[model samples]
Target: HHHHHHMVHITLDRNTANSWLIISKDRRQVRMGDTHQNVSDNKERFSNYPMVLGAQRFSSGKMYWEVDVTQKEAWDLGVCRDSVQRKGQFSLSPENGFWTIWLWQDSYEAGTSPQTTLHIQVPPCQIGIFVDYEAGVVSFYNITDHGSLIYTFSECVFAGPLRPFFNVGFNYSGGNAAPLKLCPL
Candidate 1:
């Protein structure tokens, strides 16, 4: 209830980052680039969405990660199956293997079947994600409110390993280029 913290490629993947995303040298953080730099079309690279996949894979155990979403007006944070689509058409729903939440247009919402809109009383500087594969649940926490609950996806059957990931939003606007800071342990 008090402690808080911290991938395979083990944090991020250069091969999976889109050209619009500028991955940090250590691969611990990423921001939206101006589509100026380009890279080869690797099979694992994400083309349709300005996104990147993490190297940490979860199969049978629990995994948690903290991401600094400060200053990012539009972003996606959560876990996705290693088999999640990398093409231009990536969905954020659990049915599509992505169990994430979004921060867009000053609104918070869980990527559920109906895309449940969240009413977090207080906005946080960061989000804590805890995935208990053995328990079949993935939950989001509000760091600012003493790690209060935000959203959760239950009854999940992970067919393969799951990886933490961040996705660039649908549009590029002011403050949209803010980096998604992968928190330290």
Candidate 2:
């Protein structure tokens, strides 16, 4: 029943020097072709941040999003805040020996301030996260929530141009997983 053209092609480059885009998933088909060059040597541009590009907004009901981030290092990725100033943006990551699954609320008013952050962990394995936008909550339970659970925005408006960024290079200790099909509204 859930079938659509929900696959996207993503590429990362390091402009100043030559960097690598390594994929750590056990499956062979979901790997990057090769490393790119001149990825904009923008360390500030690629830090504890979430860069959103190409987003879709819905009118009513909830949108469900899931992803598989199987890697060997710490990774962070999530939606941005809904403000022209881009203030109220929230983020999430996984711990050592685990992967991560996250859910975030999108709201303009929630963007007015910061909220308590949470941690999601998937023990020594690949992970999948399901996000229900209408409920105003993100549940991260890999069989269970032994890890921390972060609460981001409350009344999120599904608006465009959402992308993902990393604190460390995409090709760190072990490469991270490709961006999975986050359900679009």
User: In model 1, what lDDT does residue 78 have?
Assistant: 88
In candidate 1, which residue ranges exceed 4 Å CA deviation?
Answer: 2-10
lDDT of 2: 0.30
Q: What TM-score quantifies how close candidate 1 is to the native fold?
A: 0.91
Relative to the unseen true structure, what is the C-alpha lDDT of residue 65 in candidate 1, on a scale of 0 to 100? 77
lDDT for each candidate structure = 0.80, 0.30
Residue 20 error, candidate 1, Å:
1.4
Tell me the TM-score of each prediction against the true structure: 0.91, 0.38
Clashes (N, CA, C under 3 Å) per candidate:
7, 20
lDDT of 1 by residue, 1-185 (tens): 43343221247877878767788889888887766466777788888777888877788766777888787788888888899888767558888888899987899999987789898999888898888888889889898788899988899877789888788664546667678888877
- Deviating ranges (above 4 Å) for candidate 2: 1-54, 82-124, 143-185
User: Could you give candidate 2's per-residue lDDT for residues 1-185 as a string of tens digits?
Assistant: 13113223333322211133333233111222245423444432322233222233223343333334444243333433222232233333221111122333321111122323344443322322323445443233232233223333434443432333222224333344343223222
Candidate 2 global TM-score:
0.38
